[PDB]
């Protein structure tokens, strides 16, 4: 996907206003609560038996931070997401067997959480650019499956 200079600058500025710890925990927690089959991949994280248990799980939060850190790498390489995410794509396909549809779901939960976090600042225009970002990341991660 191609972001213009202005689209890139806008997603950069907005990400900087974000509490990454909160957004990471919120995103991965909501993935597990809203799409409960994704819990199968995270058995080792412990108690996921209720929404409150999921959102209060420290391993979910710490993992969410690692996922956000990967999005950060992506934002610095929007012209080469496939190369950037090649090892992670291999991990999710060949080791973890995550169906690539779930990459799209996580991206869209991130968009819902950015909206939740940022309110009016997350404008319809801001969202358009962020949809390009999360689509690009999902596509890059799905590449080893191809």
């Amino acid at each position: 996907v191609h972001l213009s200079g202005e689209e890139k600058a806008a997603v950069t500025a907005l990400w900087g206003k974000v509490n990454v710890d909160e957004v990471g925990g919120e995103t991965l927690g909501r993935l597990l609560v809203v799409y409960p089959w994704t819990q199968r991949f995270f058995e080792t994280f412990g108690d996921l038996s209720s929404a409150s248990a999921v959102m209060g799980n420290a391993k979910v939060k710490a993992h969410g931070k690692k996922v956000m850190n990967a999005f950060s790498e992506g934002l610095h390489h929007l012209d080469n997401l496939k190369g950037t995410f090649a090892k992670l794509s291999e991990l999710h396909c060949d080791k973890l067997h995550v169906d690539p549809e779930n990459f799209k779901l996580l991206g869209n939960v991130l968009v819902v959480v950015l909206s939740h976090h940022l309110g009016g600042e997350f404008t319809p225009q801001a969202q358009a650019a962020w949809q390009k970002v999360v689509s690009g990341v999902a596509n890059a991660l799905a590449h080893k499956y191809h």
């Binding site: 919120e26 909501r30 809203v34 819902v112 939740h116 309110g119 319809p124 225009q125 969202q127 949809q131």
Partner: protein
């Protein structure tokens, strides 16, 4: 169960036509292909047409929350319109549902808990399934 999705819908302002209008605006901007279903609409930002349509969508969903026991019956005419007459590709319902969640979360994050998020996602998917059926 049917009271709680109903409760959640009101608490995040699902009744509000303005939020329906914002969800449409978000959809049109993020997913430009969806505009091809509305060639008769002025797309100018403060569009009277988008405002009125936002109210239609909000009102229809708000009515539907009172009829969770029988959505196919409640949405019969709307299903005919979307599935038989307009032939809306099912991907588009997922785009609008997502933009509605984005909108509701935007304005009322305190009420848009993970549990409410899950319930409303299921509700909007259920409505989508009915509207995509013949």
């Amino acid at each position: 169960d049917k009271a709680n999705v109903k409760a959640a819908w009101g608490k995040v302002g699902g009744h509000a036509g303005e939020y329906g209008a914002e969800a449409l605006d978000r959809m049109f901007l993020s997913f430009p292909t969806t505009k091809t279903y509305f060639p008769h609409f002025d797309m100018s930002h403060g569009s009277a047409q988008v405002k009125a349509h936002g109210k239609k969508v909000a009102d229809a969903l708000t009515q539907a929350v009172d009829h969770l026991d029988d959505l196919p019956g409640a949405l019969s005419a709307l299903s005919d319109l979307h599935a038989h007459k307009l032939r809306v590709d099912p991907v588009n319902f997922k785009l609008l549902a997502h933009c509605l969640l984005v909108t509701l979360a935007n304005h009322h994050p305190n009420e848009f808990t993970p549990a409410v998020h899950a319930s409303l996602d299921k509700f909007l998917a259920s409505v989508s399934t009915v509207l995509t059926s013949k």
